[PDB]
Amino acid sequence: KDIVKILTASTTVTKTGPPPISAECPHNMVVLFGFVVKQNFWDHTNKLQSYEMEICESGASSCTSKQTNKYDVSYTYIECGPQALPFTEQVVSVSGTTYNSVKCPNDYSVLFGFGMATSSGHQSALYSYFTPCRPGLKSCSLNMNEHDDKSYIYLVCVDATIWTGLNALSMIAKDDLHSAVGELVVTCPSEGTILTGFYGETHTSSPYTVPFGKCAKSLKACSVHGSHNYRTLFTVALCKNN
């Protein structure tokens, strides 16, 4: 079964906002995969206090977010297609030391995958950057710089003996740190076109005014648009090599 074929007729869905955010899915469509990112801001300095990251369950008409923990905004992304996928499992590993690395369960292979890094506390709150994981490999390494807090590697693992040609895919992730005082574009290698991805902005002070979205499919780049404690623009996507 060609995962390209079904990732083009799948339907990305993104949602940003404070509590409550559960991004939902179209008629009889189901969450193949996805993830949720929560930001938590001190009740006084209003600076950042922490990141959190969770998985959307397989076969659900909603990203069930799953809180009694305060959290002040959540960026949510789900790929939502017709059916749940067989032999496919999602993963988050988090770390604090230099390395952060993840193996795939039942010896699977990365289909989708990326690391985010942060540095919520020194005093440079959004050190938050982004890295790609390679389709095909069983791992995903990611060394973090120092005075980083935590690294969040999230990957969708497929059983590489039924999902074919993962070696034909590639993950792109560009980011750029905008100041606190003008655009961001990233394009596929090997003249590739997008399968699925997301584009957004994050802050270390957030007033609640919204900014987040999804990449367009069978196209060749992904684009954002800028809307101390400064804030970052990012783009993650996955490409097939044509």
Numbering used by the authors: 559 to 625, 628 to 681, 683 to 742, 751 to 777, 779 to 797, 804 to 818
The authors write:
PPLPs are found across apicomplexan species, and contain a conserved central membrane attack complex/perforin (MACPF) domain, as well as a unique C-terminal domain, named the Apicomplexan PLP C-terminal β-pleated sheet (APCβ) domain, and a variable N-terminal domain. The MACPF superfamily represents an ancient homologous group of pore forming proteins, which function principally in cellular attack or defense. PPLP1 is implicated in cell traversal by sporozoites across the mammalian dermis and into the liver to invade hepatocytes and replicate within a parasitophorous vacuole (PV), as well as in the evasion of host phagocytic immune cells. PPLP1 also plays a role in erythrocyte egress by the merozoite stage (gametocyte) of the *Plasmodium* life cycle, via membrane disruption.
The structure of PvPLP1 APCβ domain was determined by X-ray crystallography at 3.15 Å resolution, to reveal as expected three β-stranded repeat motifs arranged in a prism ([Fig fig1]; see [Table tbl1] for data collection and refinement statistics). Each repeat consists of an inner four-stranded β-sheet and an outer two-stranded β-sheet, locked together by two disulfide bonds. Comparison with TgPLP1 APCβ domain (root mean standard deviation, RMSD = 0.978Å between 170 atom pairs) reflects a conserved C-terminal domain architecture across the *Toxoplasma* and *Plasmodium* APCβ domains. Flexible loops between the inner and outer beta-sheets in the third repeat, which are absent in the crystal structure, were subsequently modelled in for molecular dynamics (MD) studies (see [Sec s4] below). Three 100 ns atomistic MD simulations of the PvPLP1 APCβ domain structure indicated that the overall structural core was stable, at an average RMSD of 2.5 Å, while the modelled loops were more flexible. Comparison of loops of APCβ in PvPLP1and TgPLP1 reveals that PvPLP1 lacks an extended loop and any aromatic residues at that point in the structure, containing instead several polar and aliphatic hydrophobic residues, as well as a histidine residue at its end rather than a tryptophan. PvPLP1 did not bind to any mammalian membrane lipid species tested while PvPLP2 recognized anionic lipid species, with a strong preference for phosphatidylinositol 4-phosphate (PI(4)P), followed by palmitoyloleoylphosphatidylserine (PS) and Cardiolipin, and a weak association with the other phosphatidylinositol phosphates (PIPs) ([Fig fig2]). Sets of 20 simulations for each protein were performed. Only two binding events were observed in PvPLP1 simulations ([Fig fig3] and Fig S6). Similar binding energies of −15 and −19 kJ mol^−1^ were obtained for PvPLP2 and TgPLP1 respectively, while the absence of an energy well for PvPLP1 indicates it has no affinity for the PC:PE:PS (45:45:10) bilayer ([Fig fig3]).
